[PDB]
């Protein structure tokens, strides 16, 4: 377990949200370009919630 997820490593369309119930940022990185961002650990980001459909 190593919560080193960050908004750069995020994927456009999915809301990077914290488990406390807060929207931090949506994935600013678009999947078109090969995104390999730094593994900067942003613990305030829990997981990405893409539309549940």
């Amino acid at each position: 377990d190593r919560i080193c997820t960050n908004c750069c490593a995020g994927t456009k369309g999915c809301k990077y949200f914290s488990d406390d119930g807060t929207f931090v940022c949506e994935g600013e990185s678009d999947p078109r370009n090969p995104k390999a961002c730094t593994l900067n650990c942003d613990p305030r980001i829990a997981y990405g919630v893409c539309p549940r459909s």
Side-chain angles (χ1 to χ4, degrees):
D1 179 66
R2 184 94 268 259
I3 185 66
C4 295
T5 321
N6 55 79
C7 210
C8 195
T11 312
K12 199 220 221 79
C14 303
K15 273 63 174 161
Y16 288 79
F17 146 88
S18 50
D19 79 277
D20 80 284
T22 302
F23 169 77
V24 185
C25 55
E26 199 197 277
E28 286 205 60
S29 292
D30 186 286
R32 188 61 181 205
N33 69 278
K35 58 194 189 79
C37 291
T38 344
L39 288 181
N40 279 87
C41 318
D42 204 24
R44 184 249 302 104
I45 283 176
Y47 35 72
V49 172
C50 314
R52 190 66 185 162
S53 300

